[PDB]
Amino acid sequence: MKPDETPMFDPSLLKEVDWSQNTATFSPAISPTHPGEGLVLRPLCTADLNRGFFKVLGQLTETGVVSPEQFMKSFEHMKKSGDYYVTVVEDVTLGQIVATATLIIEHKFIHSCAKRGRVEDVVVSDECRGKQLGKLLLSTLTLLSKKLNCYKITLACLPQNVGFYKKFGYTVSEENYMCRRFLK
Amino acid sequence: MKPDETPMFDPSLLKEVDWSQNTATFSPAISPTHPGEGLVLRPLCTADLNRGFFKVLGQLTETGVVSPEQFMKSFEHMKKSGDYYVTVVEDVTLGQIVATATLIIEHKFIHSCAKRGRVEDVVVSDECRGKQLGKLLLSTLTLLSKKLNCYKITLACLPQNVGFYKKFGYTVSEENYMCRRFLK
């Protein structure tokens, strides 16, 4: 209908992550509960359409042209499933999104009907890169996936960024990542 | 409640795939509509619990111990989302599943709120490896993802199996596949 402040998921899930199990180094110490001065770590809401969500996302990959209807349809579907955790950092002093990252829960029949996590669409605004938000997002979502009882969590990255993800307990798999982009 | 014959998705979706766009070689010619004598290519149903679904799946990876309640809960969630296409081949002369493969539709905000495909949990029974079922499953699901308007489709595989997936238009990505299995 109209963009609003309704969160995609329960915001308490981020704060109730067992932060003692974080393995990334934070200087100064920040947490999901206290991400830094003037900042809030929270689920995406549809009103964020007008808070520079696509400006941040567009720094990572093309977002093309998006209508409010397109965005809200997509958001509502992600919300309904209960399996999408699109997470943002808002600078409340600006009223603008400065970082985002997504956790997706995928359901399986293998490993006794296991769940597995996927980390996607991670980007911190280029003007906001000294606030440790990338580490905060990855650690929080990785810990959240463990809280949600995932058997494993995976992601893809270019070689130069392997070192970053190793900080959260990820290792390079033996498996190759293969892709087909539909040109027709 | 009780295992039954209800399909996870509309079975016509597999048959209405544009089979002329297949790029894998089939000798003899088989299709989603006519997969081979005594065979049916169809969505998973809960009754397949008693048709060797986990026997086939267990050849790929550990399935551990699974209850009927666990299986049906997992199945019903996958069905409700509309984004899970767990597909099987049943030998109707035996009443047994002989192959399976999964297409998952993941929803994004990037690329004008795009959808992207994921191929997972592909396995053909070890006693049934001369019936071209692997190629049939991969081509059908790859074409189905295109029909469902996915921007791209991805999967992971070990190096020795790259050649197989190249038959359906997949190429090795520049990105590394990274993983964390939760030991705690």
Ligand SMILES: [Cl-]
């Ligand atoms: Cl898993």
Ligand SMILES: [Cl-]
């Ligand atoms: Cl995509």
